[PDB]
C-alpha cells in the first residue's frame, strides 16, 4: 500500500475564519468563451459599465520538476502536471454623496495559480486544504497569546514590507 | 460623501466555511531572500530532503488601465497601481509499508495575484473581502435549499471541465 | 592627551526653540528595504494615495579631504569618512470644505546629509550640536535687541533672497 | 473653505527639544559669493587656517511629480517646485598637550534640502512644521513612559544600524 | 521504518565543559554583505581601528562521495551536499603601561567548515553533536583516573606536537 | 609591562553549554599517518565499513598580514605565523527494521582551521576563548529575556538562511 503525506504535520498554524461569498453562476453568471482549455464568464447582473468576468483555464505541465531541485533519484516516473487558472476582473466605481456627476471606474483582477502534478494520491481534500495554507499566507499567526490569534498583512505587503512581522 | 462601491450589490452569492491556516512565522519560518520588492523565506521544520518555501513579491503597475476594457475617466487620481504576489512551495513525499526502496518526491506550488489600483478609498478590508470572493470560485452555490448549499469545483476544473456545472 | 576643538567658541548665535515630533516607529512604521547600506521605512497609518516614508542611508568617503583645501601637512592619516543620509517623503492633501469633490495630492520631500570623518575624538554630542548648528541657519539672530531674537528666512531662500537680511 | 492637510494627523509623535544655534550675520559672516541662485558666505571669525562657510541655493523643479509615486489630479494649480539647499561647512583641529607638532583638521559638511510645490497653500510655517518632523527621525520616540522619553539615532545610523532599534 | 547511526555507540569519550559567547547581533553588530551564497557581517560597536568581522557562507557539494572510499554499491542514491562555512576575524591590540606610544594590531582569523549530504534523516541534533566531537579534539581525555579528565591540545598542536600523549 | 587584550571587553555574549565528546585515544585510535606537518588518526574500534578518522594539520604562515586591512605602522616587527587544521571524517549507515537488506552509508566531514600569529603574549587560554567565541556563532543571543536564551541556528543557515533573526 502507498500512502502520501503533506509533510504538514510539524508545522506551526493558527487557524481563522475566512468566509467565502460562493457565486450563484445560474442567476449571476453568463458564458463568453468555451475554449477547450480555457473558459470565460460574465457577470449578467452589471451595467453596461462595469465589468465583472471570471476565467478558468488549464494548461499542462511537461515536467512537473523542471525548475525543482528534487533529486532525479526521487522523481515519479510520471513527471506530467496540471496547472490551473482561476481569474476573478471586478470593476469600481468612486462617486460622491453630494456630486452626482463626480465619478469614475477602477479596475480590480486578481488571480491564483494551482500547479497538480498528476498522481493517483493525490486527492481533492488536500488541494483544498493547500488552498487554506496557501491563502493562509495573507496573515500572521502568535501562538504567544494564550488564545491563538491572527494579525492581517495584506496592506503590509502591498506596502513594500515583505518579510513577515514575526521574523 | 466620497463612497466607492464594488458593485457586489445585485450579484447573488451563498457564504461557505474556509478555515485558513496561517503560519506562526517566528517558529516555523526564516527569510532566504530579502530585497526589496522579492522577499523569500523558508520552513525551518522540514528534514533536508523537503523544501518548503514561500515568497512575497511586489511590482509597481503603470497603468491599471492599459490592458482592460475600463479606460480611465477624467477625474481619476491616478492610473498608477501595484501587484502582490503570494507564493507557496511544497515537497510531498510518496513512500510504501511494503518497500523501503519506494519512494519519490512531488513539487507543489501555488499564488495567488492581485492588481490594486491606486485609490485612497480602496480599503484593507475592501481587498481581503475581494480575496472572498475570488476563493468563492473554487465551488458552486444554491440559493435553493433553505440552508444554502455548496458543491466543489477544483477537480472538475483541473480535469478540464472549466464551465461551471450550474451553467 | 589628544583634543579636539570645533572652533565654534568665537561665534555669535542666538538660541531657539525647535521643537521636534520624534516618530514612535513601532506604532507607526514598517520597514519597505533593508538593504546593508539603506533602509526604507513606510508608515502604515496612510490611505493608499498618501505615501509617507523615510530612507536612512550611509555611504563610505574616500578621501574626506578631497575637495576641501586642507594642506596635506595637516590632513589626519586617517582619510576615510562616512557620509549619511535621512529623508523623509509626505504627499499632502488639498480638499474643499464646501466641495467634497475638489482635492488634489502634492509631494513633499526633504533630506539632511551629514558628512563626518572617522576619527575617534569626534562624539555624537558633538555630531548633534553640528545639527543644530545647521539648523539654526534657517534663522537670522538679533544680539542688538535687549533680549536676543530670532527671525524665519526659510520663504525669503525659496523666493531667491539667499542672502541674509543682516548683510 | 480650501484646506491642506499634511495627513499627520494619525501619526503618532512624541516632542523632543532641539535648541538651535542662530548665527548674528551682522557680527560672523560676510559675502563670498552673489550669484543669482546660489549665495556663499564666509565666517569672518575664524583664523586663517579654519575655513567656516555657509552655502544657500535654489533650483528649480520642473515637474515636482516626476520622481513620485503620486501623480498630478486634474485640479492642481501647477506641476512646478522650487529645490532649497542650505550647506554648513566646518574645519575642526585636533591638537596634542603633549606635543606642539602634532595636529590635523577635519572637514565636516552637512546640508538640508527641501522640495516644496508650487500651491500657495503651503505655508512659512507649514514648512517649518515639514522640517521639524524630519529632524525628528534622528530620534526614536515612546508613549509607554509617563514622560515621553526619546532616545537618539545619529550614532547607530552613522555605525550603520539603519533600521530604527524600535522596529 | 528507516534508521541513521553514526556508529560512535561504542567509541570512548569524556565530555569537558566548554561554554560558548553566543553573539547578541542585534546590539553588537550590521550587515556588510548580502549576498545569497555568503553574508558578511561586522562589529559597529568596536573603535574604528579594531575590525570584528564574521562571514557565513554555503557551497553546494556535487558528489559529496568524491573524495571517500565508500564504493558506489553503498552510497545513497542522491549525492547532493551542502557545505557551510562560519569564518570570525579578531583585531586585538598590544600596548604598554608605561608607553602611550608603544603598540601594534595582530590579526586572528578562524573558521569553521561542516560538509552535510543531504539526507531527511541528518537532523540538527546530528549535526551539532557532530559539532562538538569535532572540537572535543582540540583536547585529550584521560578515563582511567577517579573523575574523567581532559588536557588541553591547542597550544601543543601549534607547536609542532600533533600526535596525542595516548599515542 | 606589555598587555594584549581581545577587545571583547564591550561586546554582548549570551552563555551556552557546548559539552564536548573528548576521545580517549589510547582506547580507540592509531596512527594512519605520521607526518612532521600531518597526522592522520583512525578509528580501529570501527567496523570495516565505518571509516572514522581524524587529521591535524600545521601549515606555517608567512605573512599572518596579507589579507587584513591592517596597514604596516601598526603591525609587529614579526609577520611569523602558524595555521592549524583538525578535521573529523565519519561514516553513519542507514537501515532499516523491516527490511535487512536495506541500507547505505552517508559520509560525514568537518574541520577548523585556527591561524594564530606568532607572538608570545598569544596564550593558550586566550586562543580557546577564541574558539568559543567562533563556535558560539553556531548560535544566536537573546539577552533581553529574563533568563538570557539562545536559540540554534546550524540547519537555518545550511538552508540559506545566513543573515540572524537579529539582524
Ligand atoms: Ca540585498
Ligand atoms: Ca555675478
Known amino acids: 500500500s502507498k500512502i ?27 458564458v463568453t468563451q468555451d475554449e477547450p482549455d480555457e473558459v470565460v464568464v460574465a457577470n449578467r447582473q452589471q451595467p453596461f459599465g462595469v465589468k465583472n468576468t471570471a476565467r478558468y483555464g ?4 511537461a515536467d512537473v520538476y523542471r525548475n525543482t531541485t528534487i533529486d532525479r533519484a526521487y ?7 496540471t496547472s490551473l ?14 456630486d452626482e456627476t463626480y465619478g469614475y ?16 494520491l493525490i486527492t481533492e481534500e488536500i488541494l483544498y486544504d493547500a ?7 495573507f496573515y500572521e499567526g502568535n501562538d504567544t497569546t494564550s488564545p491563538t490569534t491572527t494579525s492581517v498583512r495584506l496592506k503590509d505587503m502591498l506596502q513594500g514590507a515583505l518579510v513577515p512581522q514575526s521574523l
Open 4 to 30: 502520501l503525506s503533506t509533510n504538514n504535520s510539524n508545522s506551526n498554524f493558527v487557524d481563522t475564519s475566512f468566509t467565502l461569498k460562493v457565486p450563484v453562476y445560474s442567476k449571476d453568471y453568463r
Open 58 to 61: 488549464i494548461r499542462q505541465i
Open 75 to 81: 522523481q515519479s516516473p510520471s513527471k506530467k502536471g
Open 85 to 98: 487558472v482561476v481569474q476573478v476582473t471586478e470593476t469600481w466605481t468612486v462617486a460622491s454623496t453630494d
Open 105 to 120: 471606474s477602477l479596475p480590480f483582477s486578481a488571480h491564483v495559480i494551482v500547479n497538480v502534478p498528476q498522481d493517483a
Open 131 to 137: 488552498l487554506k495554507r496557501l491563502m493562509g499566507h
